[PDB]
């Protein structure tokens, strides 16, 4: 008997906007510690790992863990019916055919209730270890978006190189140089110069509205991790392999 009330409904809407464009299906795992989701884009070049702590929620109840087979598109469609000042409740029963989303409108005026059909689903999952990243760049989401949206028009791949983003194609090349501190920090134990697909970074950045900050993290010969923190309750980490 899962139950999770969220007085800031918007958090969840932004969450579904952040995922729906990258992955279409996904398993929502519910436990007492809270909500989690892992899933690769069908390309299999990236995934998103979601974490929403049980404390995050204003109310949270759960006496049986739970793997809910969600169609993220139709979850997005539904969540587009939530009002930003709406309180949101997710409830699901021990036994799973459906998820239920209630949107209580602020002032005891209107309630809406949406039962979403669930799918029995077998989405692969990967174990990712806790490691030390050569570099960890932090900076404002806003800026980091513009950089991908910018270099997208130059080439289809960025070379990140502590900090410098850069690209090039038929017309020429470009790069962007950030250092020091609009707050842009670095944490460095080793020069690093990988190469990622802008197509993907541009998906990741739909998560910008959840957080005024993003953080990159990288180390040679291994996947980049880009992270937006849902304030006071968790995070949304995207991972992307290099070319």
């Amino acid at each position: 008997m899962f139950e999770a009330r969220l007085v800031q409904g918007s958090i969840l809407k932004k969450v579904l906007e952040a995922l729906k464009d990258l992955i279409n299906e996904a398993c929502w795992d519910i436990s007492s510690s809270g909500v989690n989701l892992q899933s690769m884009d069908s390309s299999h070049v990236s995934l998103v790992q979601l974490t929403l702590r049980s404390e995050g929620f204003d109310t949270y109840r759960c006496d049986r863990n739970l793997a809910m087979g969600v169609n993220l598109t139709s979850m997005s469609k539904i969540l587009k019916c939530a009002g930003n000042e709406d309180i949101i409740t997710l409830r699901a029963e021990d036994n799973a055919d459906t998820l239920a989303l209630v949107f209580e409108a602020p002032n005891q005026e209107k309630v809406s209730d949406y039962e979403m059909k669930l799918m029995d689903l077998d989405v692969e999952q990967l174990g990712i270890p806790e490691q030390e990243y050569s570099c960890v760049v932090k900076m404002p989401s806003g800026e980091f978006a513009r950089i991908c949206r910018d270099l997208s028009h130059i080439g289809d791949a960025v070379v990140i190189s502590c900090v410098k983003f850069s690209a090039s194609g038929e017309l020429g090349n470009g790069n962007i140089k950030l250092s020091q501190t609009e707050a842009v920090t670095i944490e460095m134990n080793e020069p690093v110069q990988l190469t990622f697909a802008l197509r993907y970074l541009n998906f990741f950045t739909k998560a910008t509205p959840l957080s005024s900050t993003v953080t990159l993290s990288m180390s040679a010969d291994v996947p980049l991790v880009v992270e937006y923190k849902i304030a006071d309750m968790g995070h949304l980490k995207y991972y992307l392999a290099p070319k």
Partner: peptide, 10 residues
């Protein structure tokens, strides 16, 4: 590119 699972444990 290489899929994400030439880098991660299942």
């Amino acid at each position: 590119m290489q899929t994400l699972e030439s880098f991660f444990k299942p």
